[PDB]
Amino acid sequence: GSVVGGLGGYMLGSAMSRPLIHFGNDYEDRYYRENMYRYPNQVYYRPVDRYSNQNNFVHDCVNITVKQHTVTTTTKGENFTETDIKIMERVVEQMCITQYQRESQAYYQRGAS
């Protein structure tokens, strides 16, 4: 069960097995394998309907998603180091973009130009 009278503001994404995005290091690639089961495999968004634009939309979906975990690490004194956050900083954005690439259809049809 879940009981979060704030995060019901956002919806849960498409979902993905182990999202491992190739940062192109060895260390940033391994550090994931360790805490894999502790990282979020998803991100938080809405279906392009109260939340619109791309540039600042991604900056805000990225922020509000990751914030809702990094504020949660600063609850106890964040075991998630800077380099643990910076992994997720990218992953959150990619999975925001990857969700948003589904909702191309709805945007294209509901506007044009």
Short key terms for the protein model shown above:
48% helix; 113 residues; Major Prion Protein; monomer; two-stranded antiparallel sheet; globular; Major prion protein; unknown function; mainly alpha
- Major sheet: 2 strands, antiparallel
Q: Identify the strand order in the major beta sheet.
A: 1-2
What is the string of SSEs from the N terminus onward?
Answer: EHEHHH
Q: How big a fraction of the residues is strand?
A: under 5%
| CATH domain class name | Mainly Alpha
What is the domain total for the residues? 1
DSSP helical segment count: 4
CATH homologous superfamily classification: Prion/Doppel protein, beta-ribbon domain
* Helix content estimate: 40-55%
Q: Any idea what the CATH architecture is? A: Orthogonal Bundle
Number of strands: 2
Give me the oligomer status.
Answer: monomer
N-to-C CA distance: 44 Å
Q: How would you describe the shape?
A: globular
SS class: mainly alpha
PDB class: unknown function
Keywords: Prion Protein, Sheep, ovPrP, Polymorphism, Scrapie, TSE, Glycoprotein, GPI-anchor, unknown function
Assembly: monomeric
Entry title: Ovine Prion Protein Variant R168
Give an account of the 3D structure:
The structure is a monomer. This protein is mostly helical. The chain has one domain: Orthogonal Bundle (Major Prion Protein), CATH 1.10.790. The chain is built from four helices and two strands. The chain has a two-stranded antiparallel sheet with strand order 1-2. The radius of gyration is 15 Å and the shape is globular.
